[PDB]
């Protein structure tokens, strides 16, 4: 059940739209349902507050916004969470809130961006340069954060046990890639450690074939979490085996390099890059898990024969 309000509607309704939406959200929350509320824009709400603050001739703060902008956003954003509901049935519901701050730029001095960041626990920032390069979904993944890690660690350790350590390694690789990218743009890969070359190449595999997806395709309209973990497990498993091979055989006779690995098991990288296409729902869960298990066995045998 949506609430529709366009830019040509009265400023008061533009302000009240958010309050109407969250009122409906809490109403159903109190039924024991899990409610997910999506806002189109909270910058338009802040704009309504700026317009009304001016019309009322009250003293403004930064960039014309009311000094209480933060209080209004906090009031909305803090009306959410898993709760124990009132009423005999002891039912427990939740409201999730997804805000949306339209970016005048990537500068978080923006009064609305700043007030939002101080309240919300998860921020999925969208990079301008990734948008220009048509990398979708466009997420900076270096300036973003989620403060629910420790809360979800219990869930992940109960059900999967593998995700938490994979998540750690994936973040390490992406950040290491950014630092190596800064120097590569300068010296052109003239001098790199063999491990550094692997990090750059696996990070590209991740950026193109894990963090990138076309959401209008049958295969990536929705990727179930078990599959997300499967994909990441294989790519990192490759990383660890590729890194072990070159560091173990380093300073010896049969020195293993990336060029040797890529030529030796080139079909392994093709298969890893093909994992996004297994197409869930059309194909079965049991098969997708089995197919990824086969990729891991092939990589292990490929590195065993290389070393």
């Amino acid at each position: 059940a949506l609430v529709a309000n366009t830019s040509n509607m009265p400023v008061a309704a533009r302000e009240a739209s958010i309050y109407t939406g969250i009122t409906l959200s809490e109403y159903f929350r109190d039924m024991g349902y899990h409610v997910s509320m999506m806002a189109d824009s909270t910058s338009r709400w802040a704009e309504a507050l700026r317009e009304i603050s001016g019309r009322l001739a009250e003293m403004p703060a930064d960039s014309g916004y009311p000094a209480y902008l933060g209080a209004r956003l906090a009031s909305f954003y803090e009306r959410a969470g898993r709760v124990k509901c009132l009423g005999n049935p002891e039912r427990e519901g939740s409201v999730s809130i997804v805000g949306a701050v339209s970016p005048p730029g990537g500068d978080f001095s923006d009064p609305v961006t700043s007030a939002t960041l101080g309240i919300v626990q998860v921020f999925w920032g969208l990079d301008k340069k990734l948008a220009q390069r048509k990398h979708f979904p466009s997420v900076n993944w270096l300036i973003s954060y989620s403060k629910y890690m420790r809360a979800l660690d219990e869930y992940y350790d109960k059900h999967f046990t593998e995700f938490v350590p994979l998540r750690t390694k994936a973040k390490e690789i992406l950040q290491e890639e950014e630092d190596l990218a800064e120097i590569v743009q300068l010296v052109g890969k003239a001098s790199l450690a063999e491990t550094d070359k692997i990090t750059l190449e696996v990070a590209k595999l991740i950026k193109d074939d894990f963090l990138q997806q076309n959401g209008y395709t049958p295969y990536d309209r929705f990727c179930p979490f078990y599959k997300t973990v499967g994909m990441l497990s294989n790519m990192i498993s490759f990383y660890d085996m590729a890194r072990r091979a070159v560091e173990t055989t380093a300073q010896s006779d049969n020195k293993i390099t990336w060029s040797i690995i890529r030529e030796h098991m080139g079909e392994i990288l093709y298969k890893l890059s093909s994992m996004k296409f297994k197409d869930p729902v059309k194909d079965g869960e049991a098969k997708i898990k089995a197919d990824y298990a086969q990729l891991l066995e092939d990589m292990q045998n490929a590195f065993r024969s290389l070393e």
Binding site: G105, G106, D107, S109
Partner: peptide, 8 residues
């Protein structure tokens, strides 16, 4: 053009 974005 002068802006906080330009500063960043």
């Amino acid at each position: 053009f002068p802006s906080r974005m330009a500063q960043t």
